[PDB]
Design a protein around this nucleic acid. Structure first.
Ligand SMILES: [Zn+2]
Ligand SMILES: [Zn+2]
Lengths: 306, 107, 56, 115
DNA sequence: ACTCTACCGATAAGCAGACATACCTCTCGATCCTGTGC
DNA sequence: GCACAGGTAAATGGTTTGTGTCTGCTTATCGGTAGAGT
């Protein structure tokens, strides 16, 4: 609650500056507002009998500045929680309050009905997984990561790297999939866009061993496909031209590509400056994992693993 | 009857149906290496004359469209050179009756 | 299972129940039997719908 | 290409080419010339089957894995009565069920393929 | 004799459409309002 | 004193684990001859 309150609490409206700057937040005990306006403690038995909601009001601090405590809403309280009256109650107190001592709590009382939140099962984020596609499809292997921010807002940005061409086909190339870009981009171009211009450094990042000639042979078509791009600026403007449909001149395309790489390109490693080395290393690790899966040195990841 | 060796052109195929009232049939050596009618799964096919077809239709009180159909491109139809509207009698063995006769009309 | 060693191809580790229902089952073969029963239940659950659609 | 030739100047790799007049294959970079004799008959090698004795990374900490089974096979060199064995790490059905034994005393890898 | 390009046939490969046994039983929620009026 | 009537919201960017098996439409791609010379 405090993390969400302090996440985005300052907003500027326009020396005429208006700010809100929401302060700390606290949760009070469960209370009920009557018809005449009086207030009293709301116990779970009374809430169940009167078809009320076992919710407790909460307040925040405004602290308005131009250059007190205010009501924001009512939050339902789970039974037998820290804010519930039954947390510290003994057996005698529970019997007096007409509550069964064998009750375990863990449910919400809304509108006089008991509701239980069923746990939802989802795949873990920030995990690199490799799977093999169908034979008729032109994609052999896919390596994708569902990057997401924990403390920050929900993003769920998926970066998928696919190996184009089947084993029989000689046109074996690797193309990634940047967010908000509707066409696959070669890995070498993306690596150049991160500032790693020389090809030897690209190969060093991708493979950590100089004796694995099969991986270098597979990467050779990629580095050949990266012949056109030779500097960081050309890669950046190529990426920018692959985004917006030439709405503005190519001068802003480089800035747009840089911003998209700094923000959405794997937004779990970091988001500030100095991200080039770490993101390039992570991309190289992903490529290495994909090639290891292709080289049958590792098994396909299981989606049923707990 | 013309038997080509490997392949035939679409223009060549177009040329074939241009000789009235005669008929030209094209066959492949690969398809003619093995006789289809000698297979154990292929029953006997007997072509019916116009009088026989009329008698069958009258006796069973059926229309031309109210009969089982066999494609003109069927290998047995090509073997027998069946034309459009011809009726072929099929005799096959059955596990419930000793003999069974069925009729199909080329479409 | 975590209670076995790596690269173990012995029948006990691969799901052979050498016991009987009267004698009782060890936890490993109990888990294997549970997995088999779950697979069977899923198979019947899919098959009834598929055969119903086929019959229709 | 068993090995990749990298230009001494810059860091790009070298394309294959023939001198024609000299009748000698030479490797040349694109950012800079860097012309040399390129005395290597290897231009391309293709592999179709799994390498014999693939084993694994066999790090020095291979003996610290509690899940690795242990046996009493005699070590060919140091004659120890202890080792850890594992099957081939290839991820298909083409590989056999041979076992690779690793001694934790001399770090020697010996197989059980008596044949 | 096959160049300079046109319609014939014969595929590959991507774009969407339809749909998943049958019978009944019970409970539980929701079916609008905010800018605008003198 | 309180009611009265139009769809003025979001622009966006954005989403989701693992649905196959034919069907039809619309391109892209591949051979093959015809309008005739030195
Ligand atoms: Zn160079
Ligand atoms: Zn040893």
């Amino acid at each position: 609650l405090q993390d969400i309150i302090c996440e985005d609490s300052t907003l500027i409206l326009e020396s005429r500056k208006y700010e809100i700057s929401f302060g700390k937040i606290y949760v009070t005990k469960p209370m009920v507002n009557e018809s005449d306006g009086v207030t009293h403690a709301l116990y779970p038995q009374e809430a169940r009998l009167r078809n009320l909601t076992y919710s407790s009001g909460l307040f925040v601090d405004v602290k308005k500045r131009t250059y007190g405590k205010v009501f924001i809403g009512r939050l339902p309280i789970m039974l037998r929680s820290k804010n519930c009256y039954l947390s510290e109650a003994t057996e005698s107190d529970l019997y007096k309050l007409k509550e069964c001592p064998f009750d375990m709590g863990g449910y919400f009382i809304i509108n006089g009905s008991e509701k239980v939140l069923i746990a939802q099962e989802r795949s873990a984020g920030n995990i690199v997984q490799v799977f093999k596609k169908a034979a008729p499809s032109p994609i052999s292997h896919v390596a994708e990561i569902r990057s997401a921010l924990e403390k920050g807002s929900r993003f769920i940005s998926t970066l998928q790297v696919k190996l184009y061409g089947r084993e029989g086909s000689s046109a074996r190339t690797i193309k990634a999939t940047l967010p908000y870009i509707k066409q696959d981009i070669p890995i070498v171009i993306i690596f150049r866009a991160l500032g790693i211009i020389p090809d030897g450094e690209i190969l060093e990042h991708i493979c950590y061993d100089v004796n694995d000639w099969q991986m270098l042979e597979m990467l050779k078509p990629c580095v050949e496909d990266g012949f056109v791009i030779q500097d960081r600026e050309t890669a950046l403007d190529f990426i920018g031209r692959r985004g917006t449909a030439l709405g503005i001149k190519k001068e802003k395309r480089i800035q747009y590509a840089k911003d998209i790489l700094q923000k959405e390109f794997l937004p779990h490693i970091t988001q500030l400056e100095g991200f080039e080395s770490r993101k390039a290393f992570f991309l190289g690790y992903m490529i290495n994992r994909l090639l290891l899966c292709a080289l049958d040195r590792k098994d396909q990841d299981d989606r049923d693993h707990f | 009857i013309f038997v080509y060796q490997n392949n035939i052109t679409p223009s060549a195929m177009k040329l074939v149906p241009s000789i009235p009232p005669a008929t030209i049939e094209t066959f492949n050596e690969a398809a003619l290496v093995v006789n289809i009618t000698h297979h154990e799964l292929v029953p006997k096919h007997i072509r019916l004359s116009s009088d026989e077809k009329r008698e069958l239709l009258k006796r069973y009180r059926l229309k031309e469209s109210q009969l089982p159909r066999i494609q003109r491109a069927d290998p047995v139809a090509l073997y027998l050179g069946l034309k459009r509207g011809e009726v072929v009698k099929i005799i096959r063995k059955s596990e419930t009756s000793g003999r069974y006769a069925s009729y199909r009309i080329c479409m | 299972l975590p209670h076995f060693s790596k690269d173990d191809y012995s029948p006990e580790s691969k799901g052979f129940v050498e016991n009987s229902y009267l004698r009782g089952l060890t936890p490993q073969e109990f888990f294997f039997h549970a997995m088999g029963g779950r697979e069977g239940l899923i198979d019947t659950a899919v098959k009834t719908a598929e055969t119903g659609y086929i019959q229709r | 290409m068993t090995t990749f030739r990298f230009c001494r100047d810059c860091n790009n790799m070298l394309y294959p080419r023939e001198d024609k007049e000299n009748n000698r294959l030479l490797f040349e970079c694109r950012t800079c010339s860097y012309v040399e004799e390129a005395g290597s008959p290897l231009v391309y090698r293709h592999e179709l089957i799994t390498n014999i004795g693939e084993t694994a990374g066999v790090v020095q900490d291979i003996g610290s894995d509690p899940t690795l089974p242990r046996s009493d096979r005699e070590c060919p060199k140091c004659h120890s009565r202890e080792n850890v064995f594992f099957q081939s790490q290839q991820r298909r059905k083409d590989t056999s069920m041979v076992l690779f034994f690793v001694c934790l005393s001399c770090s020697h890898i010996f197989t059980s393929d008596q044949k």
